Amino acid sequence: QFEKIEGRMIRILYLLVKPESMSHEQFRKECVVHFQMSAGMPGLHKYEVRLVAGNPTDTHVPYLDVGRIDAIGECWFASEEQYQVYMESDIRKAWFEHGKYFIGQLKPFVTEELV
Amino acid sequence: GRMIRILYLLVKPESMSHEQFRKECVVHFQMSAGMPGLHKYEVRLVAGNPTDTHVPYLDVGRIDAIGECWFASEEQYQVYMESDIRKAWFEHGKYFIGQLKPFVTEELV
Ligand SMILES: CC1=CC(=O)O[C@H]1CC(=O)O
Numbered sequence: 421q422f423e424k425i426e427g428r429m430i431r432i433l434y435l436l437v438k439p440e441s442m443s444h445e446q447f448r449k450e451c452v453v454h455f456q457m458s459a460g461m462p463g464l465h466k467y468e469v470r471l472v473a474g475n476p477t478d479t480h481v482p483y484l485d486v487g488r489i490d491a492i493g494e495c496w497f498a499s500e501e502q503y504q505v506y507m508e509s510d511i512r513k514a515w516f517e518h519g520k521y522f523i524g525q526l527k528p529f530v531t532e533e534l535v
Numbered sequence: 536g537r538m539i540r541i542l543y544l545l546v547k548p549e550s551m552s553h554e555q556f557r558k559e560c561v562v563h564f565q566m567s568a569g570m571p572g573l574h575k576y577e578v579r580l581v582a583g584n585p586t587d588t589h590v591p592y593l594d595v596g597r598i599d600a601i602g603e604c605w606f607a608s609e610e611q612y613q614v615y616m617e618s619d620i621r622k623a624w625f626e627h628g629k630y631f632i633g634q635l636k637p638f639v640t641e642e643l644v
């Protein structure tokens with residue numbers, strides 16, 4: 421029941437591309453720092469960041485090319501009020517300063533749960 | 536170690552309306568229940584595309600839904616790959632998924 425209610429939270433999914441000049445070695449380290457910085461973030465229920473390890477190109481369905489994505493982030497917010505606490509937070513603002521250093525380009529998707 | 540996770544960007548067929556596509560996403564989820572080798576499937580619509588990013592905005596075109604598969608181990612992934620009900624589920628995929636991008640992910644934490 422926890423996992424079910426968690427899954428229907430406000431969720432935003434991010435495609436991350438590293439800065440052109442940053443090494444992959446450094447980008448991975450900065451993703452870990454960015455997760456550590458998320459701990460205790462006002463308003464945030466959960467953050468997850470993962471590397472893109474593979475790009476299987478052999479699809480059954482026509483393949484969609486979106487270029488090289490380096491990591492995938494995701495945030496969960498338990499309510500609109502909590503999302504607002506996060507949006508107003510100085511602590512989030514400092515987290516985003518770290519983001520400007522190790523995220524070259526970003527695509528957010530606000531998702532909608534179907535079930 | 537950790538579960539194998541594959542994320543998917545889904546674009547609906549041009550022959551299909553946004554509403555027809557939603558309903559097929561729900562069907563695809565229902566079909567996945569008890570899928571050999573699969574730990575979990577999730578599918579979500581893309582409801583918003585904010586551009587107020589601060590870091591440079593990345594344009595990947597219009598993505599209609601996000602799908603994700605979890606497998607508890609490489610042995611379960613292979614059971615899934617061999618399975619005839621997975622193959623039938625993928626035929627449903629060909630019907631409601633116009634274009635697809637998979638990402639195999641790696642945990643960091
Ligand atoms: C919201 C976020 C998700 C993520 O991966 O990082 C932050 C965005 C940012 O730091 O600019």
Ligand SMILES: CC1=CC(=O)O[C@H]1CC(=O)O
Pocket residue numbers: 480481543545578601602603604624625626627628629632
């Ligand atoms: C694997 C999958 C993820 C997804 O959303 O659908 C299947 C692929 C498919 O049905 O072609």
